[PDB]
Amino acid sequence: HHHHSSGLVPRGSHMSQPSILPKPVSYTVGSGQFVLTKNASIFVAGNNVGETDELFNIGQALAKKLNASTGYTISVVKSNQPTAGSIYLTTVGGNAALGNEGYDLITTSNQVTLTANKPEGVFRGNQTLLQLLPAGIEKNTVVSGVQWVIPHSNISDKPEYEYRGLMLDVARHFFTVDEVKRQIDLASQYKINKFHMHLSDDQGWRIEIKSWPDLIEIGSKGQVGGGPGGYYTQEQFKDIVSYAAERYIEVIPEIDMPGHTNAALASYGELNPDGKRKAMRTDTAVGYSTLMPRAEITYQFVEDVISELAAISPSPYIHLGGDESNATSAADYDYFFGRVTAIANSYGKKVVGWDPSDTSSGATSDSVLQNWTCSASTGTAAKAKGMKVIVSPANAYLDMKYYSDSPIGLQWRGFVNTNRAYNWDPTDCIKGANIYGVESTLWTETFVTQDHLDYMLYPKLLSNAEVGWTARGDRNWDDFKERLIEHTPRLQNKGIKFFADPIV
Numbered sequence: 001h002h003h004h005s006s007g008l009v010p011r012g013s014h015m016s017q018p019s020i021l022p023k024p025v026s027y028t029v030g031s032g033q034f035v036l037t038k039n040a041s042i043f044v045a046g047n048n049v050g051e052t053d054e055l056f057n058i059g060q061a062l063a064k065k066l067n068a069s070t071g072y073t074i075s076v077v078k079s080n081q082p083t084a085g086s087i088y089l090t091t092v093g094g095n096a097a098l099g100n101e102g103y104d105l106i107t108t109s110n111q112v113t114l115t116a117n118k119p120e121g122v123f124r125g126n127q128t129l130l131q132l133l134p135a136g137i138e139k140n141t142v143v144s145g146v147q148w149v150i151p152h153s154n155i156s157d158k159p160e161y162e163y164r165g166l167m168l169d170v171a172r173h174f175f176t177v178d179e180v181k182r183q184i185d186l187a188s189q190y191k192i193n194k195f196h197m198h199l200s201d202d203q204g205w206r207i208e209i210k211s212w213p214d215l216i217e218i219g220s221k222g223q224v225g226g227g228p229g230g231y232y233t234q235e236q237f238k239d240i241v242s243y244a245a246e247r248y249i250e251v252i253p254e255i256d257m258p259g260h261t262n263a264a265l266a267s268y269g270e271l272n273p274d275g276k277r278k279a280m281r282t283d284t285a286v287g288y289s290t291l292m293p294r295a296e297i298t299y300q301f302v303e304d305v306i307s308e309l310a311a312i313s314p315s316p317y318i319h320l321g322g323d324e325s326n327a328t329s330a331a332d333y334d335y336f337f338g339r340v341t342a343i344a345n346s347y348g349k350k351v352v353g354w355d356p357s358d359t360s361s362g363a364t365s366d367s368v369l370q371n372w373t374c375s376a377s378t379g380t381a382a383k384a385k386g387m388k389v390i391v392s393p394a395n396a397y398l399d400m401k402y403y404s405d406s407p408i409g410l411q412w413r414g415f416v417n418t419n420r421a422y423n424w425d426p427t428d429c430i431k432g433a434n435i436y437g438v439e440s441t442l443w444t445e446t447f448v449t450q451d452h453l454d455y456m457l458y459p460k461l462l463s464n465a466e467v468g469w470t471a472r473g474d475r476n477w478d479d480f481k482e483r484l485i486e487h488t489p490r491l492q493n494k495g496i497k498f499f500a501d502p503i504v
Ligand SMILES: CC(=O)N[C@H]1CN[C@H](CO)[C@@H](O)[C@@H]1O
Pocket: 284, 285, 286, 323, 324, 354, 372, 412, 443, 445
């Protein structure tokens, strides 16, 4: 048999017809079609009144999206007696084998029925439902001249990995609450279920800490390239968490330590050996900053930050970073990371950290390794300790240029086009581990505007999203590429300023 890899498309990027991404476990089409009309209602029914109330909220979220493009005023009804022309969302009789996020979605001429085990699975299934309707449905304004049809069809679905995440770096360049909510919303449509906020680095500190107010008054006032920076108040952070929760997305906040800490060091002189504030940094250098690993003030600082952040962050996890601590000795790093893990645990939070944080003698089997290095030896400690691993290989570093000539992006992991972002498996990155899942990382050294974020995340994130959701055996670039071409109008309709990748 003959095989080949993909080259660029001759003559440039290519960028009744559902466009489901990520690819579901099964999808069949039959004769006939459902028509969504102005008289449609969404019916919801759970196993008890509390569950029905949760489904009702999901129902309203769906109604809002459908109403924006159809111009209809679809409303939601708590009833298990859907009428012809209805969408029906239920958790009664879910197939347990599909787990918390899985669902069946069956469309007949008279009814759309989504059957899940949990409300979460109804929400994920609703992302597929939107992709079954014609392109145009994802517009934010009313679309005329499109019949709102869904083919008779049968879908069953569940994720391969539990953790399918996106990290946004808001330290290198700041992004507004609205901008962050938008990226969370867009990602949710592709079944991304985790959002990691990189809230602090050398160039800025982005979260209000009431006990150390100069973290904002001094530490938030810049970014890479000398823009004004910005920050989130605790109320704003809680708002982001709530917005994510409506999409069944867990928010994991990161305070990077002991490295990548210049903004803290520029805010409080007492965090430095000479007692003087560091000058703020607006360059892109890394590795030079460190907290004082053998001073008690360091641990008081970390405890105050963790106390305040834990109080406003419902996720059981806090990310404490641990990358590029090149101004911290191996011995001091081991000690520091163990000490801060104990603090986090005392506030009821489990610790996530970048490699090599798993090597800390203070780690527990409840700590999580975010494996970014993905070398043969990375996560040896994590594996021995039974720690879950989140993988972020080069293929998930979405801030890499698509190509040599990309106008934005970095290139220290090489180039990552839409094909490279697809053609990998988490088991490539680390062997013999408990792989919790995947996280796409969008560092922002070179991204200033929302358009920059869109360009780099779309279509790259779609590739990563499918790697997290769809089983390896059902992933195939030639298949995905053609599906992505079909999906393009939907990206346009969402107002995503995507890159028309010439490999698609
Ligand atoms: C975990 C991680 O990726 N840390 C840094 C790696 N080096 C990159 C280029 O300097 C930085 O963007 C990341 O912050």
